[PDB]
Amino acid sequence: GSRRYDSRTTIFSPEGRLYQVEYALESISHAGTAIGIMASDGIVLAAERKVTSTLLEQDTSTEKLYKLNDKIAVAVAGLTADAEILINTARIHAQNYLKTYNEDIPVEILVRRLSDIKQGYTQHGGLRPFGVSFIYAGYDDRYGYQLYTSNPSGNYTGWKAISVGANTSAAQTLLQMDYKDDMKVDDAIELALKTLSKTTDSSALTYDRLEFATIRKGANDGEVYQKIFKPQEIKDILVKTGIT
Amino acid sequence: TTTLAFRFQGGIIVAVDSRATAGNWVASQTVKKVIEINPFLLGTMAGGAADCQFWETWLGSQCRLHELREKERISVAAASKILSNLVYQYKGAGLSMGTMICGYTRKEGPTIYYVDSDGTRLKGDIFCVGSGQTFAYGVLDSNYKWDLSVEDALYLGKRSILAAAHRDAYSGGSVNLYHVTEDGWIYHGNHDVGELFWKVKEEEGSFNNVIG
Amino acid sequence: TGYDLSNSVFSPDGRNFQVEYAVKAVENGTTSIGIKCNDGVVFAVEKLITSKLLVPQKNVKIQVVDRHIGCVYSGLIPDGRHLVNRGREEAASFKKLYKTPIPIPAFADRLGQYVQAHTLYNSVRPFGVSTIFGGVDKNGAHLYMLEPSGSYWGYKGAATGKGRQSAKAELEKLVDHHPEGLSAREAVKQAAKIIYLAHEDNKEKDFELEISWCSLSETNGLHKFVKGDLLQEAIDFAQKEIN
Amino acid sequence: MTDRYSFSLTTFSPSGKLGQIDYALTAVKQGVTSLGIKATNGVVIATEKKSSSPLAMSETLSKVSLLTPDIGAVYSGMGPDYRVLVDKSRKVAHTSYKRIYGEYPPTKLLVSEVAKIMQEATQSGGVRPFGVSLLIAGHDEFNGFSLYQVDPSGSYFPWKATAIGKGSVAAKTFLEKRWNDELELEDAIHIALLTLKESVEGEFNGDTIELAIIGDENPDLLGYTGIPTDKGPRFRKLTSQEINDRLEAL
Amino acid sequence: NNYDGDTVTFSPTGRLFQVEYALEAIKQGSVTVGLRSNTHAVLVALKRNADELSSYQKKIIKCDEHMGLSLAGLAPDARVLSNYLRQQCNYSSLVFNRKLAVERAGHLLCDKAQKNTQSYGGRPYGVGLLIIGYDKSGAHLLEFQPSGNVTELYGTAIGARSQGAKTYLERTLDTFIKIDGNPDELIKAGVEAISQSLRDESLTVDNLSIAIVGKDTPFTIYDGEAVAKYI
Amino acid sequence: FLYX
Amino acid sequence: GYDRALSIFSPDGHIFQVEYALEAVKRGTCAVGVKGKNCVVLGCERRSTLKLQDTRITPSKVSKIDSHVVLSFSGLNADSRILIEKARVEAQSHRLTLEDPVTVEYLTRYVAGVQQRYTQSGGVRPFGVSTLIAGFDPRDDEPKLYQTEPSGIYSSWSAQTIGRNSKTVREFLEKNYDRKEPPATVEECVKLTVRSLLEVVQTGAKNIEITVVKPDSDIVALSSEEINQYVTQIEQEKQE
Amino acid sequence: MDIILGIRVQDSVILASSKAVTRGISVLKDSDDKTRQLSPHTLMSFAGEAGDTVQFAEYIQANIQLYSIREDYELSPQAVSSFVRQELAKSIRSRRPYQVNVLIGGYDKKKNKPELYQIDYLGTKVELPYGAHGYSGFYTFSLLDHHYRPDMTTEEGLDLLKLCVQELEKRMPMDFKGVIVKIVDKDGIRQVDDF
Amino acid sequence: DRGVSTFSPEGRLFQVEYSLEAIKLGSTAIGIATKEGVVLGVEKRATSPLLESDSIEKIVEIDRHIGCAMSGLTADARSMIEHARTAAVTHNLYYDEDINVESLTQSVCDLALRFGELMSRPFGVALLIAGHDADDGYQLFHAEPSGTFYRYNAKAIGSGSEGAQAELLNEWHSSLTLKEAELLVLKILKQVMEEKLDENNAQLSCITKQDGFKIYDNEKTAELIKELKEKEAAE
Fold this sequence. Notes:
This is part of a larger assembly, with 9 protein chains of 9 kinds. Chain C is globular, with a radius of gyration of 18 Å. Chain C is built from 6 helices and 10 strands, in the order αββββααββββααββα. In chain C, the strands form 2 sheets. Chain C has a 5-stranded antiparallel β-sheet with strand order 8-1-2-9-10. A 5-stranded antiparallel β-sheet of chain C has the order 3-4-5-6-7. Chain C has one domain (1-243): 4-Layer Sandwich (Glutamine Phosphoribosylpyrophosphate, subunit 1, domain 1). By secondary structure, chain C is an alpha+beta fold. Chain E is 32% helix and 26% strand. By secondary structure, chain F is largely without helices or strands. Chain A binds chain G through residues 3, 6, 8, 10-18, 38, 107-108, 112, 115-116, 118-119, 122-127, 143, 146-148, 153-162, 172, 175-176, 179, and chain G through 2, 4, 6, 16-17, 20-27, 50-59, 76-79, 81-82, 118, 123-128. Chain H: This is Proteasome subunit beta type-4. Chain H: Keywords: Acetylation, Cytoplasm, Nucleus, Phosphoprotein, Proteasome.
């Protein structure tokens, strides 16, 4: 029958590893680097676009940074198509929670449910896992500002600063070197760009190869604002820090 | 039908009549309206004969599976709630049962649970259920004290069924007595109203409405 | 390679090796024939007498569909029975809706589409039978032969099994020598002879002859088994021809 | 019987490659060159009509398809895979949008729905990916004119101009030199024909070239009058004659 | 070799190896003999024990008042097929007030075994059955093989060294067929038949299993001290 | 049916 | 639905998918359970290759199933969440029907029953998780510590460890834990738990988590400073 | 079932619930508690169809207790009421709807405010200073309109509640055998034993 | 790979034969049937000295008149026991009587072969089902994952089975008393057990018509172990 052609996507190696999760992580390691840095008064999401072409429309583009609700955003590393499936599920889960409780979903609950979906693809169904790692940047009235990451295994952890995709080894050493707890958003913005600038496989880091977003309480009095940076705004912030 | 169970110092007293009717027709005067689920558990039956008989028998199977699985006798609360959750699934179907789950366990002590077919589940010290529940209540309530002796409690339970057996057209036959202690239930015999009435009337000097 | 390990897989030739392998199981089976005649069809089959312990006349291989169709097959006998069971369901549902008994060409495609369906998936095995069948409908007599692939044609004469080449050679002579047509009672006697001649390719064990026939004049358009005097008459005719 | 293939036929290799997507892209590479150029006041999508036989009527085979009145699509790779995607793309524009909001979906959202269908063929049980890359040109009131590429993976990118298939490398280099942000629709059509001539080898005329635009509303193509708000489709397929006119001033 | 992975695969020579391997399970199974006259049908089964402490695996199953079989091979498969026969015999009674013909019983087993040899995921039945019965057309004996092939016989045997009993019955055919209105003599012929399949071991009281059905005899099984008569 |  | 039998027998009579699930447990961070006279303590290793972590929001290694029972684990973190969720639902379901919270044995028996089901269900791999389930039965003061493993076997332990270098810390507990006299107080039980982890961990900084469960739904997690005091005390006594 | 009252005051919510369980011409019980604690600072009183009332109350209780364990966090009274309303809103278009009317009295620890929600069996939610269900409202609402002040203490709220129970005992046809009174505040839920 | 329900060339089911290898690796379990009752005894085999041996439940009650001992992948037995208990209670509900030991065993053995591509693999555990009914009296059954069950006068299963079975062959006679059978199980367990036999690493049980199925206390078994050693030294 069909047994002959079954890859058996949801089995253990003799060593006790999940082949397809390991190979999906190897896939993500070639994806454009995405950095999340959590400050005391906001979160920064930075992401390097994969080797850009000069004729790519940069302003009306969304590859790396997506909005889940008014209080939560994600940075993507891996298959964009796979990420969009999970994002639409996450967006619905957030509205289901609001409809039920008349309260915006706490960040961890949304992250756990999305991570629990990924877990399912590793244990049953005989389908390939989602070749996607997320950096969740969000705010709720319980824990305040929160960074998380999830990976194809369906395992998620909380962070102060984290990288996913390419050159995470090099990126995590540089973040671990220059990060501190009393850091401000404007400082975190500078760290994020300086990290990408050194770990980039490109010759020089430019505005057209970057996506950038901040989640501040920089709105008017006790309310959160999401800012997905425009091309001209990334160009300005790149000159302001003195990278170009 | 008339069934009553009440809690006192000596434990729990359970008295039931023995008559079953279809309209004004008396089908039988020799019906066991108490089921012995286990040595420490008793079930009382009122309403549909089949409904009570079938589902209380079924409960006994569920109580046995509990003590096989959990290596421990089921609580009166858990036993009563299996039955109340079952009838609640059938709510609106037209099940007619008025039952009392009476037993002793270590953690609970002597316990009575009223369970009926519209899903009502009540813990309590006194319950009377049936067409002659009011007639039983009248005698039971007016004579009831917590400090009754096992002898007096058994008699009051018996006399309360007799009272209903008399006035209620749809209650009678015989009185079946039970006494639930920490050591389990004890059967205190079948008492035909045919003989019991005249015996009580003569000895007690009551029932002066009747031509002696 | 490995193209032959799974059903419904095309080889680089454009062949389904699993169907060709099912044909080998048919070639291995006992000889069965069909003879189209003037106003009907005649079916005959070789029944190898493995042992003296086989009850004569009580291991019937020819099957009836509805009341007017006869089916006989060579190869895996159970596969043949499964195909006839399907044929009986198809013929019942046709009569139920359209009132009229199922025409033979209509019936032929009902089997054809079903056998073909078992070459479309690797989750099913092709049928290990070539099925010779036919009968009498409103348009007259029809004989068909259906193969594991789902391939079927109308035939003047049909043969399948171990003695197919011997039977075919003998069938080709009848078609040549009787262009105007063969009568129902004649075809029964010829059917006997051809089974006896085709038995030369299977001559270790001696055999038992079984004949059936549909004929508008002889059987009133219904399928009946050839038994008693008519059967012994046909056997005696065949015994005379081999000597 | 029944679909026993309830497991993925696309899985990760040790290197992290998704073989069947890479091989689907190889099938697109072999496919005939198609391109799209975005102007200020419209979009152009074009492709060569590779005729299987000179007896075949290449008019019957439409490589450039209308999805909505204001959205068009062209491809490179396997034509059959493209045809069923156009059928699904047209239906999803109705079921998942028009039957809910009483208006046609904007370009980016229809593209997103097509991408979702192609992504599912990448992960669902007992299916290979689609062996096509789509170029979807479209207009909507709030986004204006837009051009999108959709790859077998289900990934989509917005383009100012691009090419896909056989001679895409050379075609993209050509478009980079010619494209500016002040191109009028007629200038974009002119460049589209110049770019496509490089990749085309045999005949180059209105019968071997398929070209459509997303431009101004066409009231004449609407089919009715009386409703002022309904002004007609922005998608228009250029005729064999209309192409040959522009090939003289080339 | 490469074509024995499942029942859905044919070999290049047109063989079903999974069906042949299921057939092999019968040969490993303990011998059982079937034989009939015109009035009675008899099953004789050599029961097998794990060791001297174990019971002897019961070989004979009753299907109706007028029908039953003996088994050789996987006993659980025999239980499935016997249970199916009981239902088909029972369906015939309730719906048509009609005892199921032994021939139809065979046809129903054949069609049930066949479906397991043509579908992916399933496996062939790993047991052979000898069905005896008395219906409206007298006494009957059937041999079921899990290939689907069902055969009506005067006598036969299946299991290990069954060739010994099968050769004997082939010689004795003319004698035992005419044992009419005599149960005990037909059983003796069956007990003498199964004796030809014995090596080193002989027929003891808890070893031998005999069943009989006939004209004025419901299907009844004899075990223990009831079969001591025939040793 | 009966009652009690 | 996906039907494939992933967990099957090998010629030597092993189910490799269950044994490979144990290898995933052996890879997982060390988890230790030590039950005293009137308490149970769950100690958990946290690997220190992860700095720039946020310990406020990061999933805690010890999970509350009910107010009176806890569950720690070793192996795949994602797999553990599915077992914990099912256990928490069964805990509320038991209260609803039996009108009484689960016993630790019953809750263990359920979780073990789930793990077993995945070892002979089609289309699923076993849980790459072994669990330590600890707590106190309703209206009971006898401490309960149970272990489950992918195969579905479960048993009661005076003290037990699971995860990486668990054989080293089990070696330690085997000679250091007296059956006749378990840790009499909370302090003694926590110290023996920390000592056992200090054989394996590396540093006693933010690498050790300690959760203390006491009778009548009295569960509390120790902070860094509280744990660091035990680490400081043990090392000073060691230098002898 | 019949009488369930609620009065939100300055710093607490007070739920009064009748103790009578009547069936036919017999008062079966005179000590019934028509309330479940959903979380430490959230209490729900219920009245309506026999069986449905308790079955619904316990089902809600289980779900809120499950949430509390999962998130190691207590849901706000607003959040719990919204959840309960949605369950009843689902219920009313079911095959057999829950015929249960509830009052949810809770103390929001984040806002430091008492909250009283009145939800009927249709899923009609309203936040009120004082609420009632069934015929009770026809007497108590006009009485509370007059005597209620928003800045009252818990003791003033209990006196205001006594005035309601007295009016109901005077003019209500049925004997409801008094009420069980419970107070929800910053320190959680406690029962007044002498009323 | 290959099908789960595949036959070997010899005519055996691979997955059933491989499950038998898993049962050989399992801890020893011995059953002896007498006219005074059936005795069930098991090797507990604690993997570590920290493991509380009384939590090792390898002997189990199905009904008051039926007990069960197991050997192999003991986790697999949980659903088999659950089914057996339901079968026993369900039969009592339908027929107001105790269920025959053979009918119970047959009900358990019907699960065995309900595997393929139903559950994904056979059971990796053999059961000794001991009981009493009015018809056939005291009975001991060996229930395999093959779906076959034999009745035994005595039977050993597990790692020390072939050695223990040879010993049971010599020792068993039809006039054994319950007390003789108890000592015989303890004797043969001590022979085949790796670690030295005591009341903590070995468990005894029995089923008698009068008192039904009873797992022995560690105190009761300890006295029988002491009685056994004295009797072996006494000659």
